[PDB]
Amino acid sequence: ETVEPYKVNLSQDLEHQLQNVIQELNLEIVPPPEDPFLPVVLNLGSQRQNQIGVVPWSPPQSNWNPWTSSNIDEGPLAYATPEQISMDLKNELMYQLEQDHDLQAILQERELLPVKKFESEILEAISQNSVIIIRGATGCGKTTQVPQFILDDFIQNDRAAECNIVVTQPRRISAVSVAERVAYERGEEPGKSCGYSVRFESVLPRPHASIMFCTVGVLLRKLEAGIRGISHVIVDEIHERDINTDFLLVVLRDVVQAYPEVRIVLMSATIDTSMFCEYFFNCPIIEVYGRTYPVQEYFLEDCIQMTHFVPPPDANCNLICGDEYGPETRMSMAQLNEKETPFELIEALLKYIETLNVPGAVLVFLPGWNLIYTMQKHLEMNPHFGSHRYQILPLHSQIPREEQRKVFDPVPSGVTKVILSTNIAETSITINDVVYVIDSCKQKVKLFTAHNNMTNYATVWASKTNLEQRKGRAGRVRPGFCFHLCSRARFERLETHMTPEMFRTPLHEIALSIKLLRLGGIGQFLAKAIEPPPLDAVIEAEHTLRELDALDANDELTPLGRILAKLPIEPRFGKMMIMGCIFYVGDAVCTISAATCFPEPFISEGKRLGYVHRNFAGNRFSDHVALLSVFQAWDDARMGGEEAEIRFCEHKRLNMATLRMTWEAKVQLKEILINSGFPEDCLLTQVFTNTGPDNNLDVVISLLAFGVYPNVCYHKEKRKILTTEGRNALIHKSSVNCPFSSQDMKYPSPFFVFGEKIRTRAISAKGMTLVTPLQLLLFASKKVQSDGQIVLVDDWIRLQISHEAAACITALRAAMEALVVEVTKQPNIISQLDPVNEHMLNMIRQISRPSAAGINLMIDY
Template sequence: MTDMKSFFMIWCQKNMVEPSFEVRPTGPKHRQRFLCEVRLSGYNYTGVGNSTNKKDSEKNAARDFVHYLVRIGKIPEESLPAGCGTMPGGQGGQQLDSGSSQPGSSRAPRMPNQVNPFMKGFLPQDLGQAYRPYIPTKEEIKQEKDNMESAESLDVNASNHGNWTIENARSKLNQWMQANKIKSDFRFTSIGPDHAKSFIAEMTVYVKELNRNITGRMSGSNKQSASKSCALSIVRQLYHFGVIEAFTGSIKSAKSSEQVAAYPVRISNQLAQRVHECLRELGIEPIKVSANAPIESISLLHPLDDALRKPQRLNLQQPTAVISWSPPVPNWNPWLACNIDEGYLANTSLDQLSDDLLHEYRGRIAGDKSLQMSLEARGKLPIAAMRDEIMRSIYDNPVVLIRGSTGCGKTTQIAQFILEDYINSGQGAYCNVCVTQPRRISAVSVSERIANERCENLGVAVGYAVRFDAVLPRAYGSILFCTIGVLLRRLESGLRGVSHVIVDEIHERDVNSDFLLVVLRDMVHTYPDLRVILMSATIDTTMFSRYFGDCPVLQVEGRTFRVQQFFLEDCIELLNFMPTPSELAKSYGDGGGGGAGRRKRPKDSEVDDEGGEGGALAIGANGKVLEECSNMNQLIDERRYSPRTKLAMSMLDEEEPSFELIDSLIDYIDRQGRPGAVLVFLPGWNLIFGLMKHLQPRRNLVVLPLHSQLPRDDQRKVFAHYGQQRKVILATNIAETSITIDDVVYVIDTCKARMKMFTSHNNMTSYATVWAAKTNLEQRKGRAGRVSPGMCFTLCSRARFERLEENLTPEMFRTPLHELALSIKLLRLGAIGQFLSKAIEPPPLDTVIEAEMLLKEMKCLDEKEQLTPFGRILARLPIEPRLGKMMVLSTLFGLCDPITTMAAYSSTFSEIFQLEVGQRRLASYQRALAGNMYSDYVAMIVAFDMWSRKRNISEEAEIRFCEWKGLQLPTLRTIAEAKRQLLDNLIQAGFPEGSMQVQRFDTQSPDEELAMTMALLCVGLYPNVCLHREKRRVLTTESKAAIIHKTSVNCGGNNSNNIMASSSAGTCFPYPFFVFGEKIRTRAVSCKQMSMVTPIQLLLFGCKRVDWISNNNGSSMVQLDGWLNLDMDPCDAAMILALRPAIQELLVRISEHPDSIGSLDSKFISLLRAIRALCLFEAGDFEIQRPKVPHEVEQHKQPRLDEDSGRGYDAGGNYGMGGGGGGPSRGAGMSYGGGNRGGGRYFNSGPYGGDMNSQSTGGGYRRW
């Protein structure tokens, strides 16, 4: 093989440019490859090559860059050394002249007078219009700097935004609007059912300094809180644009419902001395604290730690790169993103490969009758009539938008049209098509369908790649279906070898699809030979067409059968339905199920998050307030429907789907005597499971769930046929588009969707069940008419339907942008704000800044706003950055296995426990899985560990175990898949597998490893911290009231003897501090996935600001984040906080050299041991008698003996060996309920919890 690197180096010398080669190992050590990237100054391209050794990877990278230089005309092709292979795209094969109309090549030359498809200002390096700032004077810049340094904030995020807070922004907005004579007001919309309503406030104002509008859009539990949040968003955007200055007055915290009393914390002299010795080794001096109480608050953070949090202005413009691209080239597999080192493909030209593909395809057509029949059937699809027009448009335009009705065939046929056109023109090897789908099931099912149409196996011409699973097609002349997330992660190595990108279902507007559109728009501007095809349902596509420079839009009519639609009143009239008293009396809670009657207001739900507001409102998908009416079921046409129907309608709560009605509809369908599956649309897993339980007694039904978090094998069951039994599929909106279940004839639509809402200023993520949009309902209805005439039962009134919004809110406006920001930096796409300013609808600037500031605080970005090694690791983990940091830290303590399980659990947002119909809280045997740890995460880990052992026995064993413990088997399987992927990512990053050994915890008695695990959980869940007050009441950030979610192990059963339900029990927990996974906004804000932690654990890992302040009575206290108060020695607090910069330094070191974990310096070993000692639950209890927690008196299920090993499991999830099992007995005493976690020391070997010396854990890894 010719040495292309020498040729490349000679060319560089002649042109006086210096190439930069960067080689790094990739993959696990047992199958390691080397990736080389080469760059030249002045060229916006990165050459990539990889191989099993560094030398060949450099040669391959040089070859890639040389091919790029040929494509742009810098190197004549004929000057290439012999044996380098012909150039792709028609240059090395059949050269098409400029007048050719043959739609066979994406490499056709641009027409001389062809208009650039992009409007002025849309270059990749341009800053989008939405974020172009006002240019301040030097004096203004200096004044703003002085203002910033002089002000302090009580808002955890305010310092990033000029100290504008929820309390001072509204008045500033009013002043600014009056000064600029702007007349505008808030437009309120609402989401969620009447008993759990939230509001959205939106305002758009014209800013003359920017010569355009800016918009704020925020949510809250009532109109007042929503309008305050919206005003804050607008004011912070004005600040970052330089239109207004920073706030200079004294900042007042929001009025809270109650003040938090100082919680006593004391550490022993021996422990303090140990920490001091550690700091001396590290060369760190804690903050000096005077003996007198402070007059003003004093920060106790170490200067090295506090420096990370200094506010900075956002840099909106940085050097911008575009994802590297090339058409298919020799010796490159685009689906593996690597060079082909050996075999037939390594040295074969694309022309020869094209001839092979043509010969093979013609032979199959001639000899395969099944293929002939398939081609004939495909020719009858509506889209077949437009094949020539579609291909001409793709040939002539970089971007084409195809809008097709349901059943037209666009999803399955467009990619095949392109591939077959290339093959038939003798250029098959020059074609590789990547098709994105919004969901895993869509990518897999469509690829299987196309492979079946082509009468070949998956992995030949067609394949798929989704999370946890992939069957890749051949390297040339192929089609790959994948999710957008998979494609975005593969873009790190460029998009080489892909001729066409098809983005399906662009109308769904999820955050990844909007992100991908920005990437593709920049790419087609830089590489006009790349072809992009956008596909959408029959909605208004004007916005998308304009975004791509008024690209052509092709309309394809569908072939759907007639679908008879019945609205709610039609269903009731048809069935003569009347809710039964038992149905009306039901009041299902969070655990699943739905009742026909109005939900009763729970007694312990009186706490609201930010105050309440009376008056129920009719709402739509975007939450538009329609009219004052709490139940639109009362608005029916009395001329068309009987009085009985009117009565039944008035008795139904439109916010709660009636299981009895759905059951009656299925009975009606059965009576019709017509075969066909039933597809029921529900908003979430809880209702899916509740309806499954409701329908379970019916033996003539096969009831199957369909949810995005289900493993693939479970999802595939919906496509199977079940003979005489009727198939009933209970699905979320996953079944709306792209997939075809060929026997669905009936659709029952509850007309709901689950929406995630996020507000940046308080890190509030809430979930609400909302009315779906009309476009969603139309898509769902179309599912019934794909293969035959059908029926759709739309379970909302006609009055409700008429008032629904057309589309749901784009996800980019209602989700945190941290992960997206990391992806932007990983792909080298420039400044985060600059990139997002080019989005089809840019998110508010303050949310962008919040994301960037978080990444800087976490040390993911350096001072030049480039990814650090630590940031690169997090960017490659498919989880929220804080969870990724938690995982990396856990490798230092040998706790990566349980922490990764927790991260996987948090990333899936799925329920692990099953609740029986009507059951609102966990059963005692489910709560007991947490032992004495008061943690939903511990309960999950214990359950997961027990299930894993059962899974290793047999499928029957795991099913019986899940039924016994009331666990969701699909959720456990999904967590296992996600965990395996996360661990693989860490291994590929170079972390030793010895740090990932499986842990066994003792949840009934003190466990050092479990205490450290809970401390690390603070890293992943911050700022979700709450303080328990009484019963279910807790306080969250800035003392905002909330409640414990009913599905938490910390929310006890209904037994009056249970401490969690007893009003006289006082403090129910050993420590009142908790971290939690998510907030749910219902009638009140409720905290889910809660885990008890200690104040010292929060000091180390769970706070952003720590101040020493004076109390009202003249004493002083240590305050965390402006609201959590500790009665502790400020010197001790400063000493503990001085460890944090050292933790950060160690985190940076292991990110640069992950394999150094097992051979740390002695000073870092001392650091880890000191942290372990501080994180013990009793570390802050020196000479303090904590309130003792009584044992829970409920008796749970008796332990069951495992047939396979003789292990006996107790109710707490611990296990002990029976007989001569040979192993440590853990939980062999079969203890039930909570233990005494009161005062005194748990460990007998000293105040630090036993011997802190390092111990060998096997595998060559030492846990400190």
Template sequence: MAQRQGLYFNAYNRGKTLVFSKVPLPDYRADLDDRHGSTQKEIKMSNQTEVRVEDLLSRSKWNTNNSASTSTVSMRQFLPSASSSVVEPAAPIDKEKLSSQLRDLQNSRKTTASARSMQSFREKLPAFSMREEFLKAVAANQVLVISGETGCGKTTQLPQFILEEEINNLRGSDCSIICTQPRRISAVSVAARVAAERGDELGEAVGYQIRLESKRSAQTRLLFCTTGVLLRRLFQEPDLIGVSHLLVDEIHERGMNEDFLIIILRDLLPRRPDLRLVLMSATINAELFSKYFPGFTFPVAELFLEDVLEKTRYRINSERDNFAGSSRRKRFSSVKSDPLSDVFENIDINKEYGNYNITTRQSLEAWSAAELDLSLVESTIEYICRYEAEGAILVFLTGWDEISKLLDKIKGNNFLGSPNRFLVLPLHGSMPTVNQREIFDRPPASMRKIVLATNIAESSITIDDVVYVIDCGKAKETSYDALNKLACLLPSWISKASAHQRRGRAGRVQPGFCYRLYPKIIHDAMPQFQLPEILRTPLQELCLTIKSLQLGAVSSFLAKSLQPPDPLSVKNAIELLKAIGALDDTEELTSLGRHLCTLPLDPNIGKMLLMGSVFQCLDPVLTIAAALAYRNPFVLPIDRKEEADAVKRSFAGDSCSDHIALLKAFVAWKEAKRSGRERTFCWENFLSSMTLKMMDDMRNQFFDLLSDIGFVSKTTGVKVMCPLSFQTCH
């Protein structure tokens, strides 16, 4: 009835409360959930309103019984007119007519010049030649596992094949395809590419949805989203009713969300025999389809550290007076080692690298795996720019610190620092999606593009003009010590699968080159695949999600995963959730726990925000929570550490609190920004401007999340309810 009257509709409190509205409704309303003990008010309708509602119900029932139509076309016909207070019923259009319209639109857009040009490119991809075989396999199997080399067209073409086939066969009205991506930038960039190939506007037939940002409509038939977004939808719709096809990309990464999703989908498929599931990756161990997708890249030559040193003549300064060429273990005895680094430290340089010149061997003797030599990276970039052919350069680094330092080095380089000759772009997961999109644009012919990225550029996204890849061999990875209950984010060696992916980023437009800034002996000793995230990270958020989806005992559910986590890690997560009041003694969700389930945040941060709302101190809590959830905005340069510490202490004052220092620094930065002194202020106070801007954005995101669940009002900015009992507010 709501749809026919042009209203928004949602059911809350397990269907006990139905809400109709002229404005969009949130997915969840804590004030309408009786499990939370919140107060609900019943408002009596006026006689006039009651008569009108009864009339609408009668008309809706009559339409349902007498109309041959069973569906509608576009949500635009459901939206109430802003210029009229009276809602007129929208004329329903049946599925057959909608499917016909979708086919006609698709066919008409194929005839445009841009679409023909895109089609020519698509037909060159290896995936395109296997279109019919793929579609037959989708029709005949509920689950497919697709393995194909980087660049073969898995991510952009396979979802399109399904969409085109469904629309061509007049099944467009029932077609709803979801394709998950592990990262936000992947979902946005792939959606934009697919929409362009179809000749569509982004947000029409093809759209995307990431956390707190989306471009989609009721017309959308192919939605690219992050894995987290799909998990949130499963929370609302456990059976994914209406979804016809689900594609999960980059499953080789084995992130916690991906592993969790696979467990849920395994249990879901028997309930949804009509749902088609396609698992995709470039490096997964799968036989099905792998032989069909050889990849669409030119040859890529690999150079390892020893080759790079030999070619560039870069000299790594040795801390030793004499060059011996024997084991260097004694020199690094004070540095915590790792098995891969040990492989190199234990070899005899003279024996292993006898074919290389003495300068290269001396540099190898001096090289340390403990820390990346950014001067070596700078030298390698400069060598490529001076002596190699044209083409963009993609540099893989471990995090923002290295990206920022290398940016400064490049800006200070007499040759590379020329803004007219070199376009240097950072790429980091915390950057706004608008900024991230700049990396896909080709610079003028007179400029060379240099992208400094983390492993976000390793999979899913493709920067077409990259010819040179510089690989540091490491990525930041969360590791969890279950015995000491400590989690840390540290650079770790990547796997062979990741190294293969990085190499695959080059050679898209011509023969490419991959400069590995680590020895070949380390590459050969790398594990084939990375350790799954579920085995190396804290499990609190995952445990809450399991309880919120009513999937049974946490330990029993996780035991069904592909590689079950350590029981001690599960126990630690449950104990922490009990300690903060999210679970009771029987491991059931408390009132606080149910609210935390609605916040896609670490439970500690989530509780902090909820308590800040309840106790009327939300503004400072938003700032502190943003810093804790993202990163500390204070930077500590090694050569000015004492000055930086003094500045931080001055912000803390008598409180001696890191949190108060964060808060006061943020407030002072906002004031400096308003007066146009932002850059000077950050420089004088050892603060990262980018981190502070990200914190500011996260504050708004956190506030929106609290507003969506009814804890604060967007109009007044104050607490509108306190559904937590005193017992859970400790």
């Protein structure tokens, strides 16, 4: 079935050098076996424990900026008394209201919002109780108004200086957009009374009488200092059950016991909030409601029948169909695959909607950007859905806020607004003048399985709660309609609620947070959660952090673990960054790491890459080198001003926003290493060639192999690769390593590390970089067994290599790990390392070279 052992052509000069270094370091060499039926394993090999602790809290004061977490000295507000600040801010606001007519008009829109009438009740509830829950339908105005109500209360009652609100949002798009919206509602830009703080981007508001919208991750990273100088904490959209939100509620519950002066406000959609109420000591529930219209529901049976639709040529619920429908309806529906969504039926539904002769927008719920793009392309093919008749606007996370705000804009009468949206438009935002809803009844979820390291962006069935919420979006302006694209049988076999993220998400990052914040045991703390995670996930987290040496045997945070907890990326990439610093390639490795948090900068449109994009790869057969190369080129082109940058990006077909955000992310990652004590000169930008000899890039590739482990694969032919599991898989179309057409690629090595192992119809390897066999042994393997002439790597691939070489390379890995520990104890030692460590690093540098494994990337053969 599987392939023969790969020939590894290693020179004796290098084989000796390896043995000499291992001699010099005096590392324990696992000797060869006597009989070849004895596979010998070449692999080689504290503070006191806590119990529990609470995050400290303190209220706002005048000489303290809670967003920058520092004193105010230089400014005039260092001495300024609270009363002065309060009165000045009040007078400023009063003057603005009487002068600005556009602001008056905006305030008048605010007063018509359903939540307005509950202003008094909400404010009293907050003042009387440490914790409250505000429950109400989506579109009432919980998110935008409640923080303002609270702030304007403190302003207008001459105590503006005692008000600092933190507002948490599950999404990045929400934290930014809400801040922009609230600012506009107060006649400001973000920076004055409102601000935002997400990962790798922030606009901090003023120190006094200010609202800070943020993601939960940002807030948690700041809590090691404490919740210093905050009057209110608003946790929004709790019903979505974001894992970080659920986690925060655990922390906040401990806070309100020890510090009952703080105010917590939980805000929720129309769901059963018993859980949350009971969790927070039977806190009050303030109900919020407004204008609602009855919405007529339809299902796939109904939709097919009234459109007379006919398609092309769990159990299948499209086979099941009641006998109060036509024979054509049964026959037609039975041809539809449930695992697909019927794009042509949606097209038909749009055409049916305009025969009703009632003008209004159509909100179409689709799982991900792919099915939005596919639906969008489908429509614009047909001339009927053109500029004269239709305004088709996509709404997902990965488009500029320029285009996102267009969904709220009105349209000329005669044109119908169609929004192709994700679940963002389910409970988090409310698009206006929506009369019709087409619902796919799907969700998009990350399902990660640790055993095989498989990522699945799975399209899954939504809950009854989801379908009811999506149905509710149609009836805010007038009686609406909702077209569910699931069978009436399927509806019955839907779960009532989605699985919360706490049940199905890796917990290693939350585990690091727990230890950073000194909240006690990982298992102990997560047991107190509203709905605790499964045991295996906790064990998996503990296992992951032990492998990295983030935790010691006592499960206490090591110096290395402290750095990984501070870095807002995957811990494994954090460690790779640290290794990069040791090798003086920290900038490149920080660039690689940053880019994992954002979309691909290449605008490929889901196709194979063209000439321009592939050239960036050089002769390295690497998507990561391509990334680094576009950053080198982009940074050069950016020298000549903003317009020169734009032209470069749209000439090279690059997403300029992605490159900018990634750069800024890199700067902040570097910032945190500097503070942790890493020297400046191991994090400098370093020019590199992607074609010629370059040992700096060699090391990056070696370090990349560590980061993405255990994503390794072996090329057979065309696009077929073998995974770690043993199963076969495809090269992703995006890759520079994907054959452009017929001409097969002559890879100098069959081994590739890669970013994601994606589950779809088949196993796909995305973001692929070629590595040599030596790099495989060094950084892209845990377990290796030698019989004398053949080596077995992680019980999936075999190599024909010297025993001594394999054991020496495995010893280097152990030596490097030992140094990483020593370095994290005292990071500044990389400035001047003793000769023996430099000898170890130099040998790894040599092993990272293509020529080390008898490869020459110059001669394409």
